Amino acid sequence: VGPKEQRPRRLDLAWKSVETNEIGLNEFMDWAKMVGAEVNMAVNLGTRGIDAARNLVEYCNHPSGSYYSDLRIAHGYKEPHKIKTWCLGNEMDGPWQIGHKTAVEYGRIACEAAKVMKWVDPTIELVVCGSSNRNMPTFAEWEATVLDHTYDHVDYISLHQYYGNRD
Amino acid sequence: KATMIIEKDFKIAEIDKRIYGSFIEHLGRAVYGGIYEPGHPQADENGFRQDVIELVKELQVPIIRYPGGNFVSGYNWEDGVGPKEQRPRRLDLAWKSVETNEIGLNEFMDWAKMVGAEVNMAVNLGTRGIDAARNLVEYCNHPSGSYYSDLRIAHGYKEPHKIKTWCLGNEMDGPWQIGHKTAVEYGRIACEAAKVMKWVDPTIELVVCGSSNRNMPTFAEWEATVLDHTYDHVDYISLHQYYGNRDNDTANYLALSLEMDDFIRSVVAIADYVKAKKRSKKTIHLSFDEWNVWYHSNEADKLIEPWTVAPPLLEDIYNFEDALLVGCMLITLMKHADRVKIACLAQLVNVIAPIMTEKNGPAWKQTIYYPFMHASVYGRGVALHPVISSPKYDSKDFTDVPYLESIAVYNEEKEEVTIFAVNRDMEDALLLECDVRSFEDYRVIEHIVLEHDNVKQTNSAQSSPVVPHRNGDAQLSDRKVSATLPKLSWNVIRLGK
Amino acid sequence: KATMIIEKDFKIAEIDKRIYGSFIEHLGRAVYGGIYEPGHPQADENGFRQDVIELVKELQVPIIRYPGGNFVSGYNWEDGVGPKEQRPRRLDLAWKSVETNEIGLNEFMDWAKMVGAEVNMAVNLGTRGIDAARNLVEYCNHPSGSYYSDLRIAHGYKEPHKIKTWCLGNEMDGPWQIGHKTAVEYGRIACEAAKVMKWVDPTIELVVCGSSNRNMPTFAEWEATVLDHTYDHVDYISLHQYYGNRDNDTANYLALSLEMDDFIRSVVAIADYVKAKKRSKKTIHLSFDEWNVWYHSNEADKLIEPWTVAPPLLEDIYNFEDALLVGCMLITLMKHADRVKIACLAQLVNVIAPIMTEKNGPAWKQTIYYPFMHASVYGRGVALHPVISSPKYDSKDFTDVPYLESIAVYNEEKEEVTIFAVNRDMEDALLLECDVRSFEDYRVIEHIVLEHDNVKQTNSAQSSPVVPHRNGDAQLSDRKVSATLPKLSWNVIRLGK
């Protein structure tokens, strides 16, 4: 976010690419508007945590009169994005994931992130990470533990599945 | 009388030269007044003491661990790079000193280059974690075209440092450590740090922290748990050990290398337990990345007031018997060349060091400099398995202590065989006979001896009564080397042709 | 071509003769129809087959594990003692057989005495626990003057059996085991059983259960936990391993001893990890108390209906390649004489066995009998460290497999050196040259060879095509023994003087 000359070039470790950040969340919201879609925004719970989660909700959803909401206004977006549905991280059970967490570690951070996000904006919904797929050795055990930690604060649990005709 | 077989075909392993490594921490006068002293008449254009540079070069130290040690666990690497006016003064909680960060990692790399050493760089896993670890690898090793690599270029270092071997934190099991972690907490963060560092640069190697010493209540349990968490992502596990003669029992003191031997075997066993538990084809080796005599300066250190710059901490003044024990420790590393691949004499300058300096004044060699120098210079090649028969003795803490501690190293390229030997006998000479039928056309080049009548004799800036001579009597006749090892002596018998 | 140095002074350790042990379970026809067959023409007045007794004596088996194995985990020792009329018929759930208990422990001890073997007695820690453990030690070992010792006397056995070495249960990690226990559950009960057994008789030694197999999901973790719970009270940890050639790949099959070597090294590492964790001075050794080829009889056993008496279970008929692998396994045990102190060929009679019987008929020697006999008879003394240079091959599961598997054993009292050697090569002879300089005045006594052109050839009661000959060409010349090891052969090269 903010002026392009101040956006850093980063090493994206997920896909081993250099990410320029020439597109960030405000430009993506502009694109989504053009195609008539709302956005299901994911927050980083790999290298980051609860403070970044509340601040991003505030930046996106709080109208004005705080540092992060007034920042979004300064960046050229007077009206809040008012994002309804958010993902609490991504595929956190994966040994290939940046900042992988066990089901307990993830459940705990997701619970605490969910709380602060909803205190910023109680209209939102939260999605907690399921297993990366049905074949994970932690399949089902993961979902149970994660929901045990987050149930009262979240709305959905995720599933991921891909198929292929390799034979 | 003792005997030895010296058979080319009974080999332990090629010695990894990194067993002759060392270590510099931002501790006391190791950096400030040690390697770096801008006011000194013999300082170079960048403030580095040229006399110290020459003393390190003569040791041929291949690798130096940096910047800690307990210091790293509270250190921010960014505080020591870039223009000096923007580097903050910090309270170093490890050594209760004010660290100016006038030396940071780029200046240390410049120093290391001058002494011909690569750097074994440690990352902070005490107050910091995985993000700082990836960014530091990127800063050091990624060529260009990212924020951190281009930052290093801007700071005046166009070519990457290309650091090969990194430490995942320091002594994290210690209750005295900044950001101490349990074995599980450490295993987990080390695993995740290892991953991101290797994704930045897959050519690197990683060292995971062992116990701070063999006496920790979590000893062995720690290593097992840590390796269980990190095995597939790391390359070495570390061991630390210091010794001291706090009860004036020389016989027992010189036997302490047998304990180091068992310590090594124990940690090897743990690595091989975890290898089997994981069904891994990869073998983890050992980095003995702190070892030395350390005890003499304990009481003086207790009087140092906190929050000075470069206090005179850990300034052990070593004596002759300390040199003998260091010699036994070196032989012990060589005899584990199959599994100990890196070792660091802790530390290189001023701090429990073979090299000592005085402000605006001379640099000089402690007693321990000599066996270290001999092992480093003459101990490259293949470590051979000794089948020794030696007489033995009992001490307070040890039974069946051989008077003879020895090994031979064969260097095929130089066509040399070197026998390192300590005679621990406090009263009598030891008549060593080595069966060298395996080596044809070899002769004795020289027999170096380090001895002194008084085991408590030290060296100093003023005078060095403890120094090697080359009047050993080793002789080679019908495929037998016969040598007289004086009482309480370190010996280096060099053969050639 | 291959070379080998046979250096007197480069020694592994004295071989404990108990590495030539075996094992009889109440399984199939091992007891009923094996050691014990009333009315057999060769049966003695106690019903034991004399022909089997002689075949066992010729193997010189020093120790025999009994009575299980999976059987012991559901067995009540009291059911097999006292007057036969009061012994109950039980459902043995291990092998789905009706056990009559016509043989119990006192009759087994009578048999063991006749073959000159001590008994390694196993206790039930599946359905039973510490009380039955102490009571059985008391029954067997306490002289008199207590209920259980006087009971043994009343049963006809005045002198105590004085059993030295006891197994704390059987295969307790196995999901197929009666009263399976987790490593913590097993460690705790084994600890508490060990204590009470040694309080009855402090002269005993105890063996704790390892993993039932290298492939168990709890492998290595199990041993570490179990030893963590039992270290101070026990003496050995067990390993079990079986092999088979289920994909008709001989070259891969003969390399399987490299896996056994790794398994042993792995379990030794675990013991030494726990030793260090405990700061113990005691070293735990290994009892390899089940090992063999086992696979031929798998399909046949599936047809056996439950609840018969003495069914023909596990009746592998071995072939020549099986004997070669057995030879490689024996050499592997000798190579680890320093830490493997007991081993048991599983099992001794009928069940996966070197000795097979027919009812009212003959007893005969399987292919595997021969290498076992050679190893037991000629492999007493000190195992020497093998220094060998052999050509090598790759197979499906193994890389750098040496064509030569060999070790020499030096018996100083007999002034003999025995070289055991397998040539795994499926096409070519190996020309072995052994440097015997350290054995002045030794000559070749004999060179035994087990070879057969068809690896799938078996022996039977009617003929034995697979038998040793003494036409090996080993010869001494200029301090060097040269011997041709035929393709796919087991070789015993005996030297003396």
Of C22, C23, C21, C38, the closest CA to residue C310 belongs to C38
C290 known member of a binding site:
yes
CATH number, domain of B429, equals 2.60.40.1180
Answer yes or no: are the C-beta atoms of C30 and C354 closer than 8 Å: no
Portion 82-101 of A in contact with B at CB < 8 A = 98-100
Domain boundary among B359, B379, B399: B379
- Residue C442's contacts (CB-CB under 8 Å, 6 or more residues apart) are C415, C417, C436, C476, C495, C496, C497
* Cα atoms found within 13 Å of the Cα of residue C443, Cβ hemisphere only: 2
CA distances from C400 to A21, B59, C335, C430 (A): 51, 39, 18, 16
CA distances from C3 to C71, C480, C484 (A): 46, 10, 12
**What are the b/e assignments for B334-346, b being 16+ CB within 10 Å?**
bbbbbbbbbbbbb
C66 known member of a binding site:
no
Burial class, C157, CB count within 10 angstroms (exposed 0-12 / middle 13-18 / buried 19+): middle
Phi, psi (degrees; rounded to nearest 5) at A106: -65, -50
Question: Cα(C89)–Cα(C388) distance, rounded to whole angstroms?
Answer: 56
Domain boundary among B361, B379, B397: B379
Assess B8–A contact: CB distance below 8 Å, yes or no: no
Residues of B tagged active-site:
171, 290
CATH number, domain of C356, equals 3.20.20.80
Strand residue runs (E) in B424-462: 430-435, 443-450
- Closest partner CB to B192 (pick from A10, A11, A99): A99
Assess B133–A contact: CB distance below 8 Å, yes or no: no
C492 and C343 together in one domain = no
Tokens coding B474: 């080793």
CA distances from C1 to B28, B153, C403, C425 (A): 62, 59, 10, 11
Tokens coding B301: 């250190």
Of C348, C300, C291, the closest CA to residue C36 belongs to C348
Resolution (in Å) of the shown entry?
A: 1.8
- Residue C321's contacts (CB-CB under 8 Å, 6 or more residues apart) are C245, C250, C253, C254, C455, C456, C488
Q: How far is B274 from chain C (nearest CA, A)?
A: 8
B373 and B388 together in one domain = no
Question: Cα(B477)–Cα(C143) distance, rounded to whole angstroms?
Answer: 65
Please tell me which residue of chain B has the smallest CA distance to A101: B188
- Do C387 and B10 lie within an 8 Å CB cutoff? yes
Answer yes or no: are the C-beta atoms of A133 and A162 closer than 8 Å: yes
Assess B147–A contact: CB distance below 8 Å, yes or no: yes
Residues of C tagged active-site:
171, 290
Kindly tell me whether chain C and chain A come into contact, counting contact as 3+ Cβ pairs under 8 Å. no
- Do C273 and B224 lie within an 8 Å CB cutoff? yes
Phi, psi (degrees; rounded to nearest 5) at A7: -80, 125
Assess B270–C contact: CB distance below 8 Å, yes or no: yes
Q: Token match 């062995």: residue? A: B220
C441 and C357 together in one domain = no
Give the 3-state secondary structure of chain A: CCCHHHCCCEEECCCCEEECCCCCHHHHHHHHHHHCCCCCEEECCCCCCHHHHHHHHHHHHCCCCCHHHHHHHHCCCCCCCCCCEEEECCCCCCCCCCCCCCHHHHHHHHHHHHHHHHHHCCCCEEEECCCCCCCCCCCCHHHHHHHHHHHHHCCEECCCCCCCCCC
Residues of A tagged active-site:
91
Answer yes or no: are the C-beta atoms of A12 and A5 closer than 8 Å: no
Please tell me which residue of chain B has the smallest CA distance to C399: B281
- Do B131 and A47 lie within an 8 Å CB cutoff? yes
B332 and B390 together in one domain = no
Answer yes or no: are the C-beta atoms of B390 and B425 closer than 8 Å: no
Verify cis geometry, omega within 30 degrees of 0, for the bond prior to B69: yes
Q: How far is B447 from chain C (nearest CA, A)?
A: 27
Portion 181-210 of B in contact with A at CB < 8 A = 192, 196, 199-200
Of C200, C230, C65, the closest CA to residue C134 belongs to C200
Tokens coding C27: 């399984």
Assess A6–B contact: CB distance below 8 Å, yes or no: no
Assess C277–B contact: CB distance below 8 Å, yes or no: yes
Tokens coding B161: 């440092």
B414 and B477 together in one domain = yes
Residues of C whose CB is below 8 A from B271: 269
Cross-strand pairs, B449 = B469, B491
B242 known member of a binding site:
yes
Tokens coding C343: 């081993």
Assess C293–B contact: CB distance below 8 Å, yes or no: no
Answer yes or no: are the C-beta atoms of C343 and C21 closer than 8 Å: yes
Q: What is the DSSP letter of C305?
A: P
Residues of A whose CB is below 8 A from B196: 13, 98
Q: How far is B146 from chain A (nearest CA, A)?
A: 6
Question: Cα(B429)–Cα(B426) distance, rounded to whole angstroms?
Answer: 9
B326 and B409 together in one domain = no
- Do B219 and C276 lie within an 8 Å CB cutoff? yes
- Closest partner CB to C10 (pick from B262, B270, B387): B387
- Residue B138's contacts (CB-CB under 8 Å, 6 or more residues apart) are A11, B146, B148, B149, B200
- Closest partner CB to B265 (pick from C270, C272, C385): C272
**What are the b/e assignments for B203-223, b being 16+ CB within 10 Å?**
ebbbbbbbbbbbebeebbbbb
Task: Please report all neighbours of A, defined by 3+ CB atom pairs within 8 A.
Answer: B
Count how many pairs of residues, chain A against chain B, have C-beta atoms within 8 Å: 24
For residue C160, the tally of other CB atoms under 10 A from its CB is: 17
Q: Is B478 left (phi over 0), alpha (psi -120 to 50) or beta?
A: left
Assess A16–B contact: CB distance below 8 Å, yes or no: yes
Residues of B whose CB is below 8 A from A18: 145-146
Strand residue runs (E) in C129-275: 165-168, 205-208, 236-243
Question: Cα(C291)–Cα(C346) distance, rounded to whole angstroms?
Answer: 5
C164 and C53 together in one domain = yes
Interface-testing mutation among B221, B277, B387, B400, with chain C (most C C-beta atoms within 10 A): B277
Question: Cα(B48)–Cα(C234) distance, rounded to whole angstroms?
Answer: 60
Where does C142-230 have alpha helices with state H? 147-154, 183-200, 221-230
B109 and B172 together in one domain = yes
Q: What is the DSSP letter of C99?
A: E
Portion 36-55 of A in contact with B at CB < 8 A = 47
C168 and C188 together in one domain = yes
Question: Cα(B29)–Cα(B315) distance, rounded to whole angstroms?
Answer: 9
Tokens coding B312: 């005179």
Q: How far is A63 from chain B (nearest CA, A)?
A: 32
B204 and B313 together in one domain = yes
Assess A17–B contact: CB distance below 8 Å, yes or no: no
Q: What is the DSSP letter of C77?
A: G
Please tell me which residue of chain C has the smallest CA distance to B268: C269
Burial class, B148, CB count within 10 angstroms (exposed 0-12 / middle 13-18 / buried 19+): buried
Structural domain span for residue B271: 16-379
Q: Token match 């903050």: residue? A: B88
Q: Across the beta sheet with C382-384, what order do the strands follow? A: C11-14, C382-384, C404-411, C416-423, C489-496, C443-451
C99 and C217 together in one domain = yes
Residues of B whose CB is below 8 A from C173: none
Domain boundary among B326, B360, B379: B379
B76 known member of a binding site:
no
Question: Cα(B481)–Cα(B25) distance, rounded to whole angstroms?
Answer: 43
C366 and C413 together in one domain = no
Please tell me which residue of chain A has the smallest CA distance to B232: A95
Residues of A whose CB is below 8 A from B192: 99-100
- State the method: X-ray
Assess C275–B contact: CB distance below 8 Å, yes or no: yes
Three-state secondary-structure class, residue C322? helix
Question: Cα(C316)–Cα(C296) distance, rounded to whole angstroms?
Answer: 5
Question: Cα(C96)–Cα(B54) distance, rounded to whole angstroms?
Answer: 80
Assess C5–B contact: CB distance below 8 Å, yes or no: yes
- Closest partner CB to A18 (pick from B134, B145, B196): B145
Three-state secondary-structure class, residue B419? strand
Amino acid at B328: C
Cross-strand pairs, C243 = C293
Assess B138–A contact: CB distance below 8 Å, yes or no: yes
Count of domains for chain B:
2
- Do A98 and B146 lie within an 8 Å CB cutoff? no
